[PDB]
Structure 1
Amino acid sequence: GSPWARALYDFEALEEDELGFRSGEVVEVLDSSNPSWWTGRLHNKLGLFPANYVAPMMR
């Protein structure tokens, strides 16, 4: 459905439109069009997160 991406570092959300996560979580990448900030889904919510904090899972 969506690509998934592995969190490489912890990311602390500081606004409601951010998607915080812990290194190791696997984020559903709804929108990877922006080069700086992707839109993810994790813990049933949507949010922006730094595209360079994750790696695509290829399998």
Structure 2
Amino acid sequence: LGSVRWARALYDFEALEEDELGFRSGEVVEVLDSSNPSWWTGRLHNKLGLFPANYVAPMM
């Protein structure tokens, strides 16, 4: 499936809605779901949420 399990933040992402996982550039995000082309699901610092797929670099 080519799923992404980890991704590096390329840019800062500010969460503007309650379902969003914000991060700063360079942070390594755990990717839980990479199948939606726009919004991926991740975990970071014990927070779960959605973030833009093209804001990160899949690792490995």
Same fold judged by TM-score > 0.5?
A: yes
CA distance in 2, matches of 1:6, 1:53: 9
RMSD, aligned α-carbons: 2.0
Unaligned runs of 5+ in 1: none
Work out the CA distance in 2 between the residues paired with 1:40 and 1:12: 14
- How many matched pairs? 57
SS in 1 for 2:13: coil
Shift of 1:8: 0.1
**TM-score scaled by length of structure 1:** 0.90
- Which residue of the partner structure matches residue 49 of structure 2? 47
- Cα distance in 2 between the residues matched to 1:22 and 1:37: 17
TM-score normalised to the size of structure 2?
Answer: 0.89
